[PDB]
Paper text:
Rosellinia necatrix megabirnavirus 1-W779 (RnMBV1) is a non-enveloped icosahedral double-stranded (ds)RNA virus that infects the ascomycete fungus Rosellinia necatrix, a causative agent that induces a lethal plant disease white root rot. RnMBV1 is a potential viro-control approach agent for restraining and controlling the white root rot disease, because the virus can confer hypovirulence to its host fungus. RnMBV1 is an approximately 52 nm bipartite dsRNA mycovirus composed of dsRNA-1 (8.9 kbp in length, AB512282) and dsRNA-2 (7.2 kbp in length, AB512283). The RnMBV1 capsid is composed of 120 chemically identical MCP subunits and additional surface CrPs.
Small-surface trimeric CrPs are present on the RnMBV1 MCPs at the 3-fold axes. The CrP is composed of C-terminal 135 residues (Lys1292–Gln1426) of the ORF3 in the genome segment dsRNA-2. In addition, each CrP displays α-helix-rich structures, which are formed of seven α-helices (HA–HG). The total interface area between each CrP trimer and three MCP_B subunits at the 3-fold axis is 2.6 x 103 Å2. The CrPs are not present at all 3-fold axes. After 3D focused classification, one CrP trimer was recovered with highest intensity and was deemed to have 100% occupancy, whereas other CrP trimers were 30% occupancy. The averaged CrP trimer numbers per particle are 6.7 for full particles and 8.0 for empty particles, respectively.
Author numbering:
A (entry chain E), B (entry chain C), C (entry chain D): 1292 to 1426
Amino acid sequence: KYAMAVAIGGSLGSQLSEAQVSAARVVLGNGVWRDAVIDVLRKLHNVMYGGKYGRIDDIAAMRSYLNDGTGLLPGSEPIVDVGGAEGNACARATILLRGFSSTMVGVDLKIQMLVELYGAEPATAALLYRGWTMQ
Amino acid sequence: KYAMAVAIGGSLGSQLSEAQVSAARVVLGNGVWRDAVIDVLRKLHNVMYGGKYGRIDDIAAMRSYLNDGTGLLPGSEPIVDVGGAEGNACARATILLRGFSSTMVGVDLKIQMLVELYGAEPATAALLYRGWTMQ
Amino acid sequence: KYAMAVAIGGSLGSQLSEAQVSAARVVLGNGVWRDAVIDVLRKLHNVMYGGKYGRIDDIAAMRSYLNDGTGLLPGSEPIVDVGGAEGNACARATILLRGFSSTMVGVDLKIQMLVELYGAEPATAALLYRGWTMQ
């Protein structure tokens, strides 16, 4: 949904509070995310953090960067730091879905977010870019 | 829904970003909006912009102002300017649904917004104004 | 829902506008709230306002404080003041559900809010606290 995406991606920012780090596992499932979630998260991380912390290449390298450690540029500090591993990984995954309400992420990636992260249909999410039908 | 209205009307403001201009076509349909949408949009535009840019009189003159051009006071500049026509009209339509979370728009118009713009029932949207049942 | 809770609890704050005071009766029902709503509201009021205005002890004393009057410390001014009784009581009830998006309220109470105030399942609201499944 559009409102769900907007609220989830506007509420959290720059400091994941004691109860915001799990917004990913709330929006997405809790088991293994399949491949479209991971590819969208990889594209979001690229667009939003490759200018400083280097990008990642493969969908399997996003998983290895997401859960356990890193894969960013050598010497660069973590994107986000909240606490232990089980919460730091979930925060590193959450910090990306705020890319919906960000001017850096294009409209096509916002549609891809609505399609893969949240439950929305491509034909009904297509009207995210402009167009007027004399309404 | 109340949360959908609040999030959609609080997220966007004063500068419709590259991917906010189509919030109207997202909330409303994409075809022709019928008459209740247009009347609510006309009332919102009156309340929110007639003090400066003049009001509009008829539901058919809201359509003619909405899609193609104007109809505001002679010499007054556009309410919002984002880009080409197909996106400028959708932005001029979007800039009104932020009237939910605005102190200028009364509570009766907020109920009318919930009833006509979003999908909500009048009997269940009636409890927008005060009243206490010893809960 | 998570997005509904976040939007409702982030939109309103510190000044309940002409059309925010009834967010409680919008989220909750309009009749008598049963006992879980009242206990969650009592815990929220304790955590958020007992440091200054004193806490309340019983679920039945939350009702007596909620609808008609008070029960706070002797000499302490009201938590929130909007207008007449029918709206002041609803504002005093609304000012608590903003505790979701507050660093003072713990994560267990956020889960309890999602479970009792809004419609969410305990097993599906349990993933509000950290944990990573190698997604």
